[PDB]
Amino acid sequence: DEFEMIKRNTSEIISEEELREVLKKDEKSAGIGFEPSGKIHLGHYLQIKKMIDLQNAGFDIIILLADLHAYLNQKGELDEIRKIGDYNKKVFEAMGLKAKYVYGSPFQLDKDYTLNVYRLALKTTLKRARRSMELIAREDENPKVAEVIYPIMQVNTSHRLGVDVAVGGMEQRKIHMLARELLPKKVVMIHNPVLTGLDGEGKMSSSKGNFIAVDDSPEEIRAKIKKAYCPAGVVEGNPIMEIAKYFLEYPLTIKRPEKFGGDLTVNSYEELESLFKNKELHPMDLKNAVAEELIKILEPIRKRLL
Amino acid sequence: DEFEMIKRNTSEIISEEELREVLKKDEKSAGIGFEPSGKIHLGHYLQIKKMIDLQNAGFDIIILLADLHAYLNQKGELDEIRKIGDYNKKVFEAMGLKAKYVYGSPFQLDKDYTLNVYRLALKTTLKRARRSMELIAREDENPKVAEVIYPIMQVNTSHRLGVDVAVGGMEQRKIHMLARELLPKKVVMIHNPVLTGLDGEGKMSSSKGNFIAVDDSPEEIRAKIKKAYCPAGVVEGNPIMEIAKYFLEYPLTIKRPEKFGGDLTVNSYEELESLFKNKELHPMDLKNAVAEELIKILEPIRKRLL
Numbered sequence: 001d002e003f004e005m006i007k008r009n010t011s012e013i014i015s016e017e018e019l020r021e022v023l024k025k026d027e028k029s030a031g032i033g034f035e036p037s038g039k040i041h042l043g044h045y046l047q048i049k050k051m052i053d054l055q056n057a058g059f060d061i062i063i064l065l066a067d068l069h070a071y072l073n074q075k076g077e078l079d080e081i082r083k084i085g086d087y088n089k090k091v092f093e094a095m096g097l098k099a100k101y102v103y104g105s106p107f108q109l110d111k112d113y114t115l116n117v118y119r120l121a122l123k124t125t126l127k128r129a130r131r132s133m134e135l136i137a138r139e140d141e142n143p144k145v146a147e148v149i150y151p152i153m154q155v156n157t158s159h160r161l162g163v164d165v166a167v168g169g170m171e172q173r174k175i176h177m178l179a180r181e182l183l184p185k186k187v188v189m190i191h192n193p194v195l196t197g198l199d200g201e202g203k204m205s206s207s208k209g210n211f212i213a214v215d216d217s218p219e220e221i222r223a224k225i226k227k228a229y230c231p232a233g234v235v236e237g238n239p240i241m242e243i244a245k246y247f248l249e250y251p252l253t254i255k256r257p258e259k260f261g262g263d264l265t266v267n268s269y270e271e272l273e274s275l276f277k278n279k280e281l282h283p284m285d286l287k288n289a290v291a292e293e294l295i296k297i298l299e300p301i302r303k304r305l306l
Numbered sequence: 307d308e309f310e311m312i313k314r315n316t317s318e319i320i321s322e323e324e325l326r327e328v329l330k331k332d333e334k335s336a337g338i339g340f341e342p343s344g345k346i347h348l349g350h351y352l353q354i355k356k357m358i359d360l361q362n363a364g365f366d367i368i369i370l371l372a373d374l375h376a377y378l379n380q381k382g383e384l385d386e387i388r389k390i391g392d393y394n395k396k397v398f399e400a401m402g403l404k405a406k407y408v409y410g411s412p413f414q415l416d417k418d419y420t421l422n423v424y425r426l427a428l429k430t431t432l433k434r435a436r437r438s439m440e441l442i443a444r445e446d447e448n449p450k451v452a453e454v455i456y457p458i459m460q461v462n463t464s465h466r467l468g469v470d471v472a473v474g475g476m477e478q479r480k481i482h483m484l485a486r487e488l489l490p491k492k493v494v495m496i497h498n499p500v501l502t503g504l505d506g507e508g509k510m511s512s513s514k515g516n517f518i519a520v521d522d523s524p525e526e527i528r529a530k531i532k533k534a535y536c537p538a539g540v541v542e543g544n545p546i547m548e549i550a551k552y553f554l555e556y557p558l559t560i561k562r563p564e565k566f567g568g569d570l571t572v573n574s575y576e577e578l579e580s581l582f583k584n585k586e587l588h589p590m591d592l593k594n595a596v597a598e599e600l601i602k603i604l605e606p607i608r609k610r611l612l
């Protein structure tokens with residue numbers, strides 16, 4: 001159905017009941033926000049892919065190019081941030097996402113919007129605010145006041161934009177729980193899993209350089225996956241297995257030499273999971289297959305950006 | 307001279323050099339802000355008296371009825387706060403202060419003013435911000451985000467108002483130091499001492515009920531001073547001695563029975579300080595004299611409010 005179609009590959013939906021009530025409505029909107037990023041990676045793609053699922057399910061899509069938030073989170077100057085946001089819009093369009101793209105500053109600095117921010121600041125403890133920025137705040141030995149304004153700003157935007165569904169990675173859940181409590185109208189939160197970095201040490205990040213950009217070249221992709229963390233029989237924290245699960249189409253024909261078993265055909269990721277977990281599928285073979293399928297996947301996108 | 311006239315009874319002037327440069331200018335402005343208070347006490351009077359000193363010295367006076375700050379500091383709703391601010395203006399006018407009175411919200415919610423607040427939030431650490439609100443923040447077991455917005459708001463207002471001199475109690479110095487660092491144009495800070503409460507346990511405060519309101523009745527004043535902390539020979543932390551120092555005119559004729567030494571005439575507070583410190587002047591006699599002089603002082607003000 002549509003519900004499960006949307007539920008597929010998500011970490012959680014804050015209230016599947018509320019989401020069912022939403023699917024009944026004729027006009028429904030889903031929204032996601034991104035601090036403009038210099039490089040758009042699989043992490044972003046995973047989420048845009050999810051926005052497309054919702055769109056296919058009749059949701060109007062709202063993409064917030066969060067320039068003010070990025071400004072508050074030390075990403076630089078607004079106009080500079082604004083141009084990177086511009087580029088992101090194109091990469092998002094290149095991914096096949098037809099939607100309403102809006103910057104945050106045009107309305108996030110409005111007289112009333114601000115009074116609402118201060119109203120929320122009166123009900124948001126500093127400890128609660130600091131906690132929600134743990135996975136989002138730019139690393140800083142001397143946390144700025146801006147760090148705690150950021151979360152309440154995100155909450156006021158959810159109010160302003162008035163979407164039925166808000167999508168984001170699991171790292172956004174605390175700011176989302178905060179909004180669930182502070183806001184009068186409860187919005188459904190769809191949380192996407194956070195991909196692991198290629199080296200498997202942490203989560204995939206634009207600043208940690210452990211990602212695969214959607215416009216990376218075929219050679220770059222092959223080289224990135226080749227060096228990627230991928231222990232035989234290990235699925236948890238295996239970035240390569242995550243890519244197979246979140247981006248690959250099945251049945252998947254893992255091509256390999258007869259000398260090693262010959263071409264293998266997997267009808268589902270779960271099946272691939274078994275084969276790899278039971279060490280019947282070798283890392284090098286998993287990689288070559290993921291790398292080639294991924295390249296095909298991203299090609300259309302890279303072509304458009306070029 | 308004018309300098310010392312302004313320096314009289316102040317705790318500190320952040321840069322007496324800068325203050326001298328200011329006195330040379332033809333047009334100079336001095337400003338002070340108050341979170342609207344239900345009762346205006348000696349603490350406020352001390353500061354308005356100081357604003358008048360500056361006014362007599364050719365300064366244009368700006369009085370900020372800080373409704374937004376009070377809102378941020380949990381004083382209630384803006385309109386309610388706005389009406390108490392209205393009443394304060396009259397009490398201030400009743401004190402003989404002719405000046406420009408402005409609320410903060412009319413300009414503190416402006417698009418650019420807000421972006422400037424966020425700019426400042428990017429250079430103000432949370433620890434630095436928390437520290438400046440130690441003597442100002444409303445008591446709260448769960449510090450709100452609003453607490454740290456307050457200080458940067460005060461700093462942006464100093465920028466906006468563009469006064470040459472900013473006046474306030476010593477409890478405001480950390481927020482003032484913060485402004486000295488963050489702002490491009492350095493404004494002179496004149497800090498007034500903080501009066502001790504009548505019970506001598508803490509500082510005089512509108513919420514601690516240890517103050518003398520300028521419109522208190524003669525009977526109320528007499529009764530408040532009678533019960534006031536005032537150890538014989540002790541000057542430090544003696545609220546009664548502070549009142550004699552900051553509000554009384556000299557020579558001061560301390561009236562008392564011949565049975566106890568008869569009427570005494572002191573030509574200066576310093577002299578009074580000696581007499582009291584050397585236990586030659588009794589607390590009860592100090593009180594009766596301060597109480598009667600204070601009543602005369604405030605009378606004009608109380609009459610006008612009635």
Ligand SMILES: N[C@@H](Cc1ccc(C(=O)c2ccccc2)cc1)C(=O)O
Nearest residue numbers: 031032033034035064066154157158
């Ligand atoms: N916090 C996200 C960026 C972000 C997400 C969401 C928001 C919203 O307030 C929003 C957008 C769309 C719908 C509802 C709410 C602003 C900014 C990040 O770390 O990149």
Ligand SMILES: N[C@@H](Cc1ccc(C(=O)c2ccccc2)cc1)C(=O)O
Nearest residue numbers: 337338339340341370372460463464
């Ligand atoms: N913090 C003060 C109130 C306050 C003082 C000063 C200000 C200003 O920003 C200001 C006013 C006038 C001039 C310069 C600066 C705002 C609010 C209090 O505890 O009551």
